[PDB]
Amino acid sequence: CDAFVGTWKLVSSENFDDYMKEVGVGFATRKVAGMAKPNMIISVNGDLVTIRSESTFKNTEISFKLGVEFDEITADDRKVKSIITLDGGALVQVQKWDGKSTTIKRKRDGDKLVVECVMKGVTSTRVYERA
Amino acid sequence: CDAFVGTWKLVSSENFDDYMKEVGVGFATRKVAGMAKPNMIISVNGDLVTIRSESTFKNTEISFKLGVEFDEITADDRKVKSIITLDGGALVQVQKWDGKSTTIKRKRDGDKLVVECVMKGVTSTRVYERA
Incomplete structure (x- = not known):
């Protein structure tokens, strides 16, 4: 797992709010x-x-x-x-947790670090890149 | 995982044939x-x-x-x-393998080593004990 070592900055985010909503995150904190x-x-x-x-x-x-x-x-x-x-x-x-289950995938795709968060179908995608 | 270290002898087997049949094991070898x-x-x-x-x-x-x-x-x-x-x-x-998936659980239960093999509902249980 030496391909993941380093410091990474977020560069994009898609469907994160939907994902958080699914895990049961409160409206207020969900925005923050x-x-x-x-x-x-x-x-x-x-x-x-x-x-x-x-x-x-x-x-x-x-x-x-x-x-x-x-x-x-x-x-x-x-x-x-x-x-x-x-x-x-x-x-x-x-x-x-509590009978529920979420999976978080961290994969390398070129010079990017793609994070895929899944929870009952909903998928959030956040891309990072070396700082 | 130091609780699993050692030599173990099979002592019991239940529904193994059903399990093998499910993974797609041939009749002849299934018996052997x-x-x-x-x-x-x-x-x-x-x-x-x-x-x-x-x-x-x-x-x-x-x-x-x-x-x-x-x-x-x-x-x-x-x-x-x-x-x-x-x-x-x-x-x-x-x-x-080939889109299919089986899980094999090895757990300690007292002085026994219980192996649970699952494949689409069917479950095989084989108990072992220190030789």
Whole structure:
């Protein structure tokens, strides 16, 4: 997963609001989240991968090992069970909570970092590029 | 995943034939497979986990890292894409091939090693115990 290492700036966002609405994000915070242009900083240290997101909305940080389930408090304050795998060359994270389930795909496409968030059909696409 | 390390003997098997039939295993080999009492030998060396199965049917060996997709030629000669994770304290392996998908769960239940194989509803249960 050395292809993901680095600092990335958000450059585009599509259907994010629809996605947040689906996960059950409140109207107010949903707008504050949408106006944010985060700086995802992926890093690795041994078998531990760390994805740090810095936004005007909320700074989050998750450190994990691949294929090993972990606990996470999402930005929208959901308490979920996560597991990240390197599937088909892409960092595939699936979040399970209250019987519900969302998947977050992080894949490289040229010089871009494409993030696909899926929740019951709805798909949000956010593209990043090296800062 | 140190709870899985060791040598294990098969002690029981339920609905295995139904499971094999579902994955598309031929009648003849399906019977030869069912008459086998394999010795699953799980081992670890650093970040590499190796599951060695020894049977009168066919000796298979897979070495892998958790959360990292790998190529595997199953005992019944299927060429699949596998990914093993430590989900909910259990070694959860999912095999993808030709649009189809089977999942193999390996969990500890007391002094036993329970293997649950699922393929479109059908579930096979094989219990092992330290040799």
